[PDB]
Amino acid sequence: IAALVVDNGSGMCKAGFAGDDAPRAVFPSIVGRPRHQGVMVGMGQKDSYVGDEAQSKRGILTLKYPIEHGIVTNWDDMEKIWHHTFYNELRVAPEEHPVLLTEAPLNPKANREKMTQIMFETFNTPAMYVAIQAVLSLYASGRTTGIVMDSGDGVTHTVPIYEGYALPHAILRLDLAGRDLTDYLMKILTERGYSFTTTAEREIVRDIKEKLCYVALDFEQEMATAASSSSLEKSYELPDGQVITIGNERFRCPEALFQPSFLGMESCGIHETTFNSIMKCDVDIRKDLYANTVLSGGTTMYPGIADRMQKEITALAPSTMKIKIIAPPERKYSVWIGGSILASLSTFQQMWISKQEYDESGPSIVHRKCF
Amino acid sequence: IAALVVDNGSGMCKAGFAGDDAPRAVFPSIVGRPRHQGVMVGMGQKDSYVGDEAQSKRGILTLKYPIEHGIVTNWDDMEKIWHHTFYNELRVAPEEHPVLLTEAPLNPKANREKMTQIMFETFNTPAMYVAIQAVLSLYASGRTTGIVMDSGDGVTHTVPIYEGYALPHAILRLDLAGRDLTDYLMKILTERGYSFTTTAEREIVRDIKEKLCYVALDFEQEMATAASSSSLEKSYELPDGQVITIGNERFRCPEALFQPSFLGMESCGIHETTFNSIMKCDVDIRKDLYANTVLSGGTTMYPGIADRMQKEITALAPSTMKIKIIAPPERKYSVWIGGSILASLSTFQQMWISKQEYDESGPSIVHRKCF
Amino acid sequence: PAWXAXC
Amino acid sequence: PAWXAXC
Amino acid sequence: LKIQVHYYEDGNVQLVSHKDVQDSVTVSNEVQTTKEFIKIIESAENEYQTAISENYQTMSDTTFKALRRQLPVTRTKIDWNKILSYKIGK
Ligand SMILES: Nc1ncnc2c1ncn2[C@@H]1O[C@H](COP(=O)(O)OP(=O)(O)O)[C@@H](O)[C@H]1O
Ligand SMILES: Nc1ncnc2c1ncn2[C@@H]1O[C@H](COP(=O)(O)OP(=O)(O)O)[C@@H](O)[C@H]1O
Ligand SMILES: [Mg+2]
Ligand SMILES: [Mg+2]
């Protein structure tokens, strides 16, 4: 039987069977409910739409993300996401196949506990493992020594991993993520009088970000150009047909990854957290990391972010280093791909916790393997 | 005129006139700058704040320590700490009283010049001296021989002082201290779902470290008890009124002082660096030292730390050497206390570098001493 | 409706 | 807000 | 120039070393040659001691580490369950 691989991303759920080269199910991790009383009873409405359903019916629903910064905040909402993942999106009985769960680094013990409990007892999975997302990210490029800079909708994190072993004390988390950049995008679009408030409107702003924002290579000269010619500014049209112009705002939004001060976060920028994790690594190995900075997760998709990460972390490194930013295509779903790779293998076939083990030993098996 | 005694500690600056048995000023050595714009211009708001003003204003300031690990990082920030010490904390003109500066052993020779030049040329001190911290500690403890284990916010220092002299060859500077220990508390709190990131938030964690945390006499026995029963669990509520619930974390943090492995530190633990220092001595003085183990500086305060230190270092020494741990109260301040005594000696009143001596010799006064 | 798009 | 005492 | 040290309190450690020096000089006066030869001896012995203290207290830690490490590449103590089970990738 083929194990099931699920990337529990904060914004989108990527899932499939082991050995697929790309995820089968790729959908926004949304649970919806209706904002108004239902009146055409002959329609036969259902009380909570999920995934692409909620995104289809958008403006009659309140939209809930159950995962905030990797923390599962609402469990019955997340349980419905997994129910839909299994019975509808993949069409499989999860009690008959082993399951691979991705998880974010430095995420509290209880999240793994409740994930475990729900898998082993709501879905009765037969065997299971929970992988540190960055491991899978590095593995996805086929390399086995580097530092990963992961940056999803909910978490940005830096993990050094050498000869395939992680450095746990040298990990960093920064919660400034894709949602936060959507937040700041609202605020700056408000300057040109484009207000967006409802969750539905939030999704419009997410769409806008995903197609007109880009990482400026040279912020000062760019912003001087933006104050000198309209040629850097362009437009997009709403689901309401009307056009909206995105301008200075284009670059100002993604600039925040390097300047978290712009969202009033004192926390260091992504170039600083990568550097500050390399400098937490043992003095020997820093070279091996500089040739192997791998980017992963969807907010690493901004045009020019690689160029900026390079030209920035260049300044943080000493001169005479091969500072090479590994930013391929498929970085989008890389984490999942790595899951599928690792899942296919007899060595990893030792790692999966048997349901029976958990059943007999309680949470005491997972309380170890979470490190 | 009476002398002024100043302790340039990593975390808190302890200061006051000589002969006194408690310092007249005790404050966190912080330069705190604005995080945000001062819109209410009528406040008379400051370019930076210091000490208890910064700690009151915590929520709106970027808190920078000018000493990190043990070295001054930015001279003008330290210079502000000193200016504030004189004019605000003590309300005195530094031109008018002799001055003593504490200093760490093996601090590079140029630092002595910078301190000396600032104290004469910025602050016009009428006489000056610079002293090895650790000496003052034993001196304050009365005894004329022993091994110091001094640990504040930045450096753990071990010195065997014999016939009233530091033995320089035996001095084991250890980069593990209070600040480093604070970081690890952040992580073990994270396990249970509490988060803290901003440099303001760091100081909140410091308050917790100084209250709930303690040293267990034997690690897994205690931990097994804690894993069995919630009896070992206590609480402390943040400025935002929510209680934190804490058990297993309480002994786990300061365990690190015995296990630098927990933080990936290559250097040995606190008992270890003490032994490892003892063994370097002229062999005849070994027993003179073992009866004379002296603890000091703020990190030495944790409940059970002395009893643990005894059971720990007893393993390393050959038995029947009668190892004894001097750890009464008031050891929070032994270093500054020592200087206050030293500055009361009539011979020392002859021995200061005078203002007139520096005004003829400049910083070259130290070149006879520094080799 | 007061703003440009949006309300 | 996610976090138990922080976000 | 040669140095030899032995310690044996419980186990044993030994230091063994040589340096060879070649130089060229010019001859002027009895006082000046006296001073000059001494200056060379002074310089050579003080540099030789300076290297053998200051370099060996740091660089020997790094080369001895390159022969066997103090903590692993992970900077963590190894874990027997994961070490038995996980033949981690090439
Ligand atoms: N073309 C794009 N440019 C910038 N950001 C993007 C782009 N496409 C997707 N994203 C961001 O990727 C984030 C989610 O990526 P992903 O890692 O797949 O989901 P999750 O973060 O939940 O695991 C979203 O917040 C979205 O803003
Ligand atoms: N009662 C206590 N419990 C735990 N930690 C303490 C206590 N008192 C002081 N400390 C720690 O000692 C550190 C500073 O020690 P101290 O030697 O007084 O400062 P410095 O070395 O800068 O002079 C602080 O970071 C503080 O966390
Ligand atoms: Mg993700
Ligand atoms: Mg001190």
Measure the CA–CA gap between A357 and A366, rounded to whole angstroms: 10
Would you call A169 and E89 a contact, using CB atoms and an 8 Å cutoff? no
**Chains adjacent to D (≥3 CB pairs closer than 8 angstroms):** A, B
| Helix axes of B133-140 and B334-342: crossing angle, nearest 10 degrees | 90
DSSP conformation letters of A119-174: IIIIS--SEEEEEEHHHHHHHHTT-SSEEEEEE-SS-EEEEEEETTEE-GGG-EEE
**Shortest alpha-carbon distance between residue E19 and chain A (Å):** 29
Ligand 2 center from residue B206 Cα (angstroms): 9
Q: How many CB pairs under 8 A join B and E?
A: 9
Chain B residues with beta carbon closer than 8 angstroms to that of E76 = 261, 264
**Is beta strand A99-103 parallel, antiparallel or unpaired with respect to A4-7?**
parallel
Chain B residues with beta carbon closer than 8 angstroms to that of A71 = 193
**Is beta strand B172-174 parallel, antiparallel or unpaired with respect to B165-166?**
unpaired
Statement: A176-267 belongs to CATH 3.40.50.1110: no
Would you call D4 and B196 a contact, using CB atoms and an 8 Å cutoff? no
Ligand 1 center from residue A329 Cα (angstroms): 13
H-state helical runs in chain B: 51-56, 75-84, 109-117, 133-140, 178-190, 199-209, 219-228, 249-252, 270-278, 286-290, 305-316, 334-342, 348-351, 355-361, 367-370
B176 CB less than 6 Å from ligand 2?
Answer: no
Ligand 2 center from residue B152 Cα (angstroms): 5
Assigned CATH topology for domain A134-175+269-334: Nucleotidyltransferase; domain 5 (3.30.420)
- Position B95, amino acid: E
**Is beta strand B325-326 parallel, antiparallel or unpaired with respect to B293-296?**
parallel
Helices (H) and strands (E) in chain E, counts: 3, 2
B178 CB less than 6 Å from ligand 2?
Answer: yes
Task: Give this entry's resolution in angstroms.
Answer: 3.8
Closest CA to A174 of A245, A257, A114: A257
Within 10 Å of residue B310's Cβ, how many Cβ atoms? 16
The CA distances from residue B260 to A369, B174, B221, B250, in Å, are 22, 11, 20, 17
**Shortest alpha-carbon distance between residue A316 and chain B (Å):** 18
Would you call B194 and D6 a contact, using CB atoms and an 8 Å cutoff? yes
Chain C residues with beta carbon closer than 8 angstroms to that of A201 = 6
Within 10 Å of residue B47's Cβ, how many Cβ atoms? 7
Would you call B190 and A266 a contact, using CB atoms and an 8 Å cutoff? no
Judge contact between B111 and B102, C-beta under 8 A.
no
Judge contact between A336 and A7, C-beta under 8 A.
yes
User: By three-state DSSP, how is residue E81 classified?
Assistant: helix
- Ligand 2, atom 23, lies closest to the CA of B9
**Token digits of residue E27:** 């001859």
The method of structure determination was cryo-EM
Would you call E76 and B266 a contact, using CB atoms and an 8 Å cutoff? no
Judging contact as 3 or more Cβ pairs under 8 Å, the answer for A and B is yes
Judge contact between B58 and B239, C-beta under 8 A.
no
The ranges assigned to domains in chain A are 2-133+335-371, 134-175+269-334, 176-267
Integer Rg of chain A from CA: 21
**B2-133+335-371 and B176-267: same fold?**
no
DSSP run (H or E) holding B298: none
Closest CA to B220 of B180, B259, B189, B194: B259
Of the partner residues E72, E85, E90, the one whose CB lies closest to the CB of residue A350: E85
Chain A residues with beta carbon closer than 8 angstroms to that of B191 = 108-109
Judge contact between B177 and B151, C-beta under 8 A.
yes
**Is beta strand B234-237 parallel, antiparallel or unpaired with respect to B243-246?**
antiparallel
Would you call D5 and B197 a contact, using CB atoms and an 8 Å cutoff? no
Measure the CA–CA gap between A75 and A64, rounded to whole angstroms: 12
**Is beta strand A146-151 parallel, antiparallel or unpaired with respect to A156-162?**
antiparallel
Ligand 1 center from residue A297 Cα (angstroms): 7
Closest CA to A18 of A121, A148, A144, A129: A129
What atom in ligand 2 is closest to the CA of residue B14?
23
Q: How many CA atoms lie within 13 A of C5 on its CB side?
A: 19
Give one word for B142, left, alpha or beta, with left for phi > 0 and alpha for psi -120 to 50: left
Ligand 1 center from residue A202 Cα (angstroms): 14
Would you call A169 and B36 a contact, using CB atoms and an 8 Å cutoff? no
What atom in ligand 2 is closest to the CA of residue B297?
17
| CATH no. for A2-133+335-371 | 3.30.420.40
**Is beta strand B99-103 parallel, antiparallel or unpaired with respect to B4-7?**
parallel
Question: Chain B interface, mutation test: which of D3, D4, D7, most B Cβ atoms within 10 Å?
Answer: D4
Judge contact between A100 and A341, C-beta under 8 A.
no
φ/ψ of residue E13, rounded to 5 = -135, 140
**Shortest alpha-carbon distance between residue E69 and chain B (Å):** 10
φ/ψ of residue A124, rounded to 5 = 50, 45
Give one word for A75, left, alpha or beta, with left for phi > 0 and alpha for psi -120 to 50: alpha
B155 CB less than 6 Å from ligand 2?
Answer: no
Contacts of A105 (CB under 8 A, 6+ apart): A132, A133, A134, A155, A157, A159, A171, A173
- Ligand 1, atom 18, lies closest to the CA of A298
End-to-end, the C-alpha distance of chain C in Å comes to: 4
Question: Chain D interface, mutation test: which of B185, B194, B207, most D Cβ atoms within 10 Å?
Answer: B194
DSSP conformation letters of B66-98: SEETTEES-HHHHHHHHHHIIIIIS---GGGS-
Order of strands, edge to edge, in the sheet holding B31-34?
B49-50, B31-34, B61-64
Measure the CA–CA gap between B16 and B86, rounded to whole angstroms: 10
Measure the CA–CA gap between A218 and A212, rounded to whole angstroms: 17
Judge contact between A203 and A196, C-beta under 8 A.
no
Closest-CA residue in chain A for E65? A284
B55 CB less than 6 Å from ligand 2?
Answer: no
B23 CB less than 6 Å from ligand 2?
Answer: no
